[PDB]
Amino acid sequence: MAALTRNPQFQKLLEWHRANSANLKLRELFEADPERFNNFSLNLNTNHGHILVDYSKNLVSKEVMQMLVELAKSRGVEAARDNMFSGSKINYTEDRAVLHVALRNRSNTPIKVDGKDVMPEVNRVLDKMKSFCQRVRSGDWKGYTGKSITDIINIGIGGSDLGPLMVTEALKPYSKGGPRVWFVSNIDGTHIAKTLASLSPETSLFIIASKTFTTQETITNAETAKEWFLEAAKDPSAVAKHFVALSTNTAKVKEFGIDPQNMFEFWDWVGGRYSLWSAIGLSIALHVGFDHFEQLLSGAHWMDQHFLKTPLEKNAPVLLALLGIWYINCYGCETHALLPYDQYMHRFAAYFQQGDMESNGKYITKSGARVDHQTGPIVWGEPGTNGQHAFYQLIHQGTKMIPCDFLIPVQTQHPIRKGLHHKILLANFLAQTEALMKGKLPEEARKELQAAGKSPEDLEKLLPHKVFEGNRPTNSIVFTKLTPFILGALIAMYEHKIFVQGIMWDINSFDQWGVELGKQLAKKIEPELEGSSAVTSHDSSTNGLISFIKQQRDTKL
Amino acid sequence: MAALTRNPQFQKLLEWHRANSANLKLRELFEADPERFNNFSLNLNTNHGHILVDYSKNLVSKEVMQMLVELAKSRGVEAARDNMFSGSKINYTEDRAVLHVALRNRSNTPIKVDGKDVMPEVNRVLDKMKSFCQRVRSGDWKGYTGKSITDIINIGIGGSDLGPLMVTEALKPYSKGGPRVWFVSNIDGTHIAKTLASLSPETSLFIIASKTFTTQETITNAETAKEWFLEAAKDPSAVAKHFVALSTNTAKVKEFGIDPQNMFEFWDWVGGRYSLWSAIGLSIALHVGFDHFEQLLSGAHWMDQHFLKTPLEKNAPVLLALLGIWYINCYGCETHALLPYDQYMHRFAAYFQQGDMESNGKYITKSGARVDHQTGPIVWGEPGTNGQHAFYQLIHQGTKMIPCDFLIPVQTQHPIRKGLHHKILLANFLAQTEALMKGKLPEEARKELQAAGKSPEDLEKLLPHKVFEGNRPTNSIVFTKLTPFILGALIAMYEHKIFVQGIMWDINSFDQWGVELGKQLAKKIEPELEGSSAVTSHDSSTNGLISFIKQQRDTKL
Ligand SMILES: O=P(O)(O)OC[C@H]1O[C@](O)(CO)[C@@H](O)[C@@H]1O
Ligand SMILES: O=P(O)(O)OC[C@H]1O[C@](O)(CO)[C@@H](O)[C@@H]1O
């Protein structure tokens, strides 16, 4: 078996769940104990705003939380955390350190990899980012015809795309005086084509973001951009004014034709899905300014210190992780919904699809054993209140148990109509988790239908459809305002939740071997698409789909 | 029990699954039968492009498909379909017809509700839409200062937002000569505030889209838009040049202050999540032109006729529905991923989140009995190839079974660089489903490790991490080009899939009683947020969150 399932604290938790979980009823838990909110919430004071993590609407008791904390201790969470923070090579399949925490280490306390402090190089690159941002944003940096830069285009995919996009979207109010930012990621030619159609080569700066600098989508997109640029500029020296690279691969950056002084370096111990804190964040810094980028790093650093120094029972990422384990490994819930009541946060869920699913969508443990339990959940969601009018029907009255994280800032960036919109937004945020918890009993629904003047026949017909079973668990995460600092703290909180779950499952949260096969097979198919000849080299489906492509590509529509 | 579980064809299917499903291996199924693709795919010729529905990479044999088709028949799918198309009041909890098919009934064959043909009124509103589109797009419709309209702003949420947004995004290449379109939906003030910031009241036309015309988010947003407009126009009579309504509620439209001739009507038998085909599609028609809108309707009509006339065993929406039943009710899969390899289709999954989840996220059957089986899945996804660099790690190497629909057009709208980008996109599309099916064997991975110069110790340790178990089922849906017609056919296909699944579960796909509780509780909370007085009227969590909101809203960061 595997480390988690062999663990006696886990088997105790699972047995308790089998015997006792059906007796957990949220409505009754709240009625019986006025102190429930106080006992199952964390009000964190960062000194730059508060983050309230309210986990009281979860299917847990004091006993359950004690068992979960005991399990975390038994699984070596604290030791594993310390090892990450000290630069130990905990990414064991790649023999790499895992040091996104170094990127935002504002204290500058040495963190060593191979006996060498990484902080000098972290800070050197940050200083380079700061200098570059000043030059571009001030208008001093000129394009090949002598004009100021108006548009920045980040070209990258996955970890080189999702973070910068999510953060620039989330921090849009902080972008006055910054250039417009565009994100090109898909190989689908639509993406670059529609972006380039709205740009001038004279005033556009391309940021080629790629840890490896060999990803086919990114390098192809980058080459397409360079061809478009050179068609206008007709001078290879002009590339140095319009193309920069964010990478670990100096040789491949040089090969592509980017100036050595136009390379913003990061390191192998920066995972792609943990990379927005590094050079990869350059588009963030250009868009909102380096000061705000530093605030973002500082917020993450605050949360890092919270994670590092706080007892497990009061440790936010640990508690979130443990609640997740409870729902995944005891209740068997396949998914986790992220529901921010904030339009600016509309790419938050998509970001953590990579962060969570690429990290913990694994099946082999440190011991070499295949897991005999569930690992990472499917992450999904849309901003409130939109989701209420799309899929909450299923959350309330479907057949699935779906743990939800509801997030909202107390203070809006746009307090229009004297705060009316935000009042309504907050009311819905609060009501939905209340509704999920409480439900509506048959007798409560009966009274409502009776009051509406329904006939005994019409009442009886409609009654069961109006019943809400409730007992649906949520987290509510409420914060003063979505500032750069608070956003940084929130992202880091989930990064650490993901880390804790990975340690408890005994998997490597920091590799991604699962992407290799698709890349290999695509390279084989690429040249087979050319020409009109039939492909017979694969299974009949792949062959048949290729035949369809070849037959349909010349039809006029 | 419930209708489905009491059904002997279902019992037979479930027993077969229990006894035999472990023997189903995709690799073996293809190896044993070179005709597999031919036997398990449908190449549909619409006369305006082909749609290939390739379901061969599913964990099904001939006998499984036979059992599934037999279940569809014994659950009354054929009869239920005919009842929908004839105007029977199959939305039984609300006593309503379900006639989105009438909206796109291009044949004009009479469809009666209460003995009255609905087609003359459907066509009257379409004619009104066509005339309005001419006036606006030509520039003849002038704003309050006499200028042509340049921007259209749809205000609406859920069914009044998702369809028009998704379709205008998908059909962007067809929008030459059309006004820019904007979609405001969230109550979050950010949404309307950032939309209005870049617009001129002189050249902007607002479309207020709401079936009921009472949805709080939409009416509040509409009133905010009107205030913003009147600040500039200072003339209440000018509202008639800048505000139109799409609704079933004539009285509430009048009450809001919209011109009677500025109302585009639809009917109660148009469900919100099935409404883009009605007046709700006005923003589509404005953006891409009425001709293209008619093509969209015509494609849907083609698929309606395919659904109506085709024997179940080769009926596209029925087969997709049945595969879904197989995975949901036999394998226990919670989710269904929609993965379009098309940037223009980036809102397709979000659309079917409502279409599928609000429809079939249900737990009460026609008899009033609770289901004792699963119903609608959680729908999620992102466009390829981006998803490959975000969450496919989990699809390939996680612990969840996840049915995936892969979709792609053969012809791209942007064949840049002599088709290079699209070649790569297609190769990835093909390779991913091939990889999911095949996996990678230890013998294959071992040789790769050996060639990479790995030591015997390192090879041993790394090997299981590099193996792909495969046997992960997919559908591949490939179509000539994403034209208005083809998009219409594709949306209709999934609409009918959802319908077939609902009938089989014995639930009502067409109501949404599950949204009521959240709305009720929000109305109670809204007035409590104003002022400094403590709120104690709820559970301690709701009270504690409100206390936090009141304490934190004055803090200066
Ligand atoms: O069009 P309306 O009446 O404003 O409703 C918007 C949405 O709200 C719902 O009624 C509830 O989610 C959806 O079915 C609908 O599409
Ligand atoms: O930054 P790179 O090297 O181009 O990689 C892009 C993405 O591809 C992956 O390696 C595969 O998903 C991600 O982990 C990564 O963020």
Residue whose pair of structure tokens reads 């108006």 in the numeric block: A150
Question: Of B525, B523, B521, B502, whose CA–CA distance to B512 is shortest?
Answer: B502
Please tell me if the CB atom of residue A216 comes closer than 6 angstroms to any atom of ligand 2. no
Read off the DSSP letter of residue B468: B
Q: Distance of alpha carbon A411 from its chain centroid, rounded?
A: 23
Show the CA angle centred on residue A313, arms to residues A309 and A314, nearest 5°: 60
Q: Which two tokens stand for residue A76?
A: 């070596």
A203 is an annotated ligand-binding site residue: no
Distance in angstroms (rounded) separating the CA atoms of residues B14 and B6:
12
B221 lines ligand 1 (CB under 6 A): no
Q: Quick one: CA dihedral B64, B65, B70, B72, positive or negative?
A: positive
Ligand 2 lined by A275 (C-beta under 6 Å): no
Q: Could you tell me if the CB of B394 is within 6 A of ligand 2?
A: no
**Residue B512 Cβ contacting ligand 1 at under 6 Å:** yes
CA distances (Å), origin B109, targets B85, B382, B429: 11, 39, 40
The stretches of B389-507 forming alpha helices (DSSP H) are 392-397, 416-438, 442-451, 456-466, 484-505
Best mutation site among B215, B266, B357, B516 for ligand 1 pocket (most ligand atoms within 8 Å of CB):
B215
Q: How many CB atoms lie within 10 A of CB B504?
A: 28
Catalytic site residue A418?
A: no
- B336 labeled part of a ligand binding site: no
Which candidate in B169, B294, B358, B382 is catalytic?
A: B358
| Structural determination approach | X-ray
Query: CB A74: neighbour CB atoms within 10 A?
Result: 15
**Which residue is closest in CA terms to ligand 2's atom 12?**
B389
Joined together, the tokens standing for residue B522 give 């929000």
User: What distance in angstroms lies between residue A95's CA and the mean position of ligand 1's atoms?
Assistant: 52
Q: Which helix (H) or strand (E) holds B496?
A: helix B484-505
Closest CA to A94 of A507, A512, A501: A512
What does the radius of gyration of chain B's CA atoms come to, in whole angstroms? Answer: 26
Q: How long is chain A?
A: 557
Query: Would you tell me how many other CB atoms lie within 10 Å of the CB of residue B131?
Result: 11
Counting ligands in written order, the one closest to the CA of A211 is: 2
Among the bound ligands, the one closest to the CA of B276: 1
User: Which of A389, A424, A540 lies closest to B526 in CB terms?
Assistant: A424
Are A189 and B412 an interchain contact pair (Cβ–Cβ within 8 Å)? Answer: yes
Q: Which residues contact B369 (CB under 8 A, 6 or more apart)?
A: A464, B1, B2, B3
* CA A272 to ligand 2 centroid distance, Å: 6
Cα B166 to ligand 2 centroid, rounded to whole Å: 28
Please give the full DSSP string across A261-300, using - where no structure is assigned: GGEEE--TTS-GGG-TTTGGGHHHHHHH-HHHHHHHHHHH
- What residue owns the CA closest to ligand 2's atom 14? A272
User: In angstroms, what separates the C-alpha of A493 from chain B's closest C-alpha?
Assistant: 19
DSSP β-bridge partners for residue B53 = B42, B477
Residue A470, annotated ligand binder? no
Q: Please choose, from the candidates B413, B417, B412, the residue with its C-alpha nearest in 3D space to the C-alpha of residue A231.
A: B417
State in Å: Cα A450 to ligand 1 middle: 25
Determine the Cα–Cα distance for residues A321 and A499; give it in Å rounded to an integer.
Answer: 8
Out of A389, A414, A523, A524, the active site residue is A389
Candidate from B37, B410, B420 with C-beta closest to A553: B410
Say which residues have a Cβ less than 8 Å from residue B254's Cβ, sequence separation at least 6. Answer: B260
Backbone angles phi, psi at A270, to 5 degrees: -100, 105
Distance from CA of A110 to the nearest CA of B (A): 31
Give kind and range of the element (H or E) at residue A44: strand A41-45
Residues of chain B in contact with residue A191, where contact means CB-CB under 8 angstroms, are 343
Number of neighbours of residue B451 by Cβ within 10 angstroms: 8
Query: How much distance in Å is there from the Cα of A158 to the middle of ligand 2?
Result: 5
Which residue of A30, A385, A426 is in closest CB contact with B529?
A426
Residue B532 annotated in ligand binding: no
B162: which chain A residues are within 8 Å (Cβ-Cβ)?
Answer: 390
3-class DSSP state of B239 = helix
The beta-carbon neighbor of B422 closest among A189, A417, A467 is A189
All structural domains of chain B, each given as residue ranges with its CATH number in brackets, are 1-99+295-515 (3.40.50.10490), 100-294 (3.40.50.10490), 516-556 (1.10.1390.10)
Angstrom distance (rounded) from CA A29 to CA B129: 55
Helix, strand or coil, per DSSP, at residue B89: coil
Q: Minimum-distance ligand to the CA of B355?
A: 1
- Smallest CA–CA distance from B523 into chain A, residue: A427
Has A373 been labeled as part of a binding site? no
The answer to whether A207 and A282 are in contact (CB under 8 A) is: yes
How many Å apart are CA B496 and CA B464, to the nearest integer?
42
CB distance A218 to ligand 2 below 6 Å: yes
Is any atom of ligand 2 closer than 6 Å to the C-beta of B389? Answer: yes
- Of the candidates A169, A358, A382, A495, the residue annotated as catalytic is A358
Q: Which residues of B are less than 8 Å from A158 in CB distance?
A: 386, 388-390
Is B389 tagged catalytic? yes
Instruction: State whether A383 and B220 contact (CB < 8 Å).
Output: no
Buried b (16+ CB within 10 A) or exposed e, A496-533: bbbbbbbbbbbbbbbbbbbbbbbeebbeebbebbeeee
Count how many residues are written for chain B. 557
Is B499 exposed, middle or buried (CB count within 10 Å of its CB: 0-12, 13-18, 19+)? Answer: buried
Chain A residues with CB-CB distance to B385 below 8 A: 157, 186-188, 217
Tokens of B222: 């509409």
Of B12, B62, B389, B524, the active-site residue reads: B389
Q: Please confirm, yes or no, whether B434 is among the known catalytic residues.
A: no
Tokens of B231: 């600040």
Six token digits for residue B303: 């698929």
